[PDB]
A paper describes a structure:
We focused our attention on human [name], an ATP-dependent recombinase crucial for homologous recombination (HR) and for error-free repair of DNA double-strand breaks. We therefore explored the possibility of using a more stable orthologue as a surrogate and focused our efforts on archeal [name] from [name], a protein that was already structurally characterised and is closely related to human [name]. Here, we describe the complete process of generating robust, [name]-like surrogate systems from this archeal protein via two distinct approaches: by stepwise mutation of the surface of the [name] to humanise the BRC4 binding area (HumRadA series of mutants) and by generating an archeal/human chimera (ChimRAD51) in which all of the BRC4 binding part of [name] is stabilised by parts of [name].
The structure of HumRadA2 also highlighted the need to introduce further mutations at the back of the Phe pocket (particularly V232Y216) in order to force I169M158 and K221M210 into the same conformation as observed in the HsRAD51:BRC4 complex. Proper humanisation of the Phe pocket also required the removal of an insertion that lies just before V232216 (residues L226–P231). Overall, the structures of the humanised [name] proteins are very similar to each other, and significant differences can only be seen in loops that are involved in either crystal packing, or are mobile and poorly defined.
Author numbering: 108 to 226, 232 to 286, 301 to 349
Write the structure that this text describes.
Amino acid sequence: ATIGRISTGSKSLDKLLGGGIETQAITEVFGEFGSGKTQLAHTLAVMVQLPPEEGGLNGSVMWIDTENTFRPERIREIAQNRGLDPDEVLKHIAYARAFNSNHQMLLVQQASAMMKESRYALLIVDSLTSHFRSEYIGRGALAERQQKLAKHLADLHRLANLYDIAVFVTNQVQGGHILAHSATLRVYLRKGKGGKRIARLIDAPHLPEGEAVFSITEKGIED
């Protein structure tokens, strides 16, 4: 992984992303359940804690959970298989459930208070859209749903830039999922076979089209 970025754990996925995930930016990963999107989030929550030589930023994590995504048992396994102390890794993941889209937005707006006293380098939102989709139903509420989501993405981008944090969010295709303003780096995941998952990058403004295969292992993800 390159200077100032966080390695995903997979050398081929890092290459596809131009050297790993960036701070001061939003990486948005699309896929169905089983595609590896949440496995990648769990892996990043450990990788960011590593020193720069090993692909991290010695940073803490904030995890905003909108649908029971976070598995501390998985973090413990990944940490153990990457030579880290699992209890220390968990102590540096600030977990917060978001009960609705308003609460999800407020959690982001209030997050920087805890960032002056500890060095955070990663904010995960898993998932970005589940509350927005369940709360704003039909054509009569669609414009408001997209405006609210765009405002949330602007808040995340501001936080990312002010505190030098990588923002990593998950999503699902449906064109319900496309916004008028492109606030993120979009990565599309799909499930393969034999432990493999495939990532595709198709419309990045400063990265060419590409694809990468990675594996789900006891180390989280790797080639």
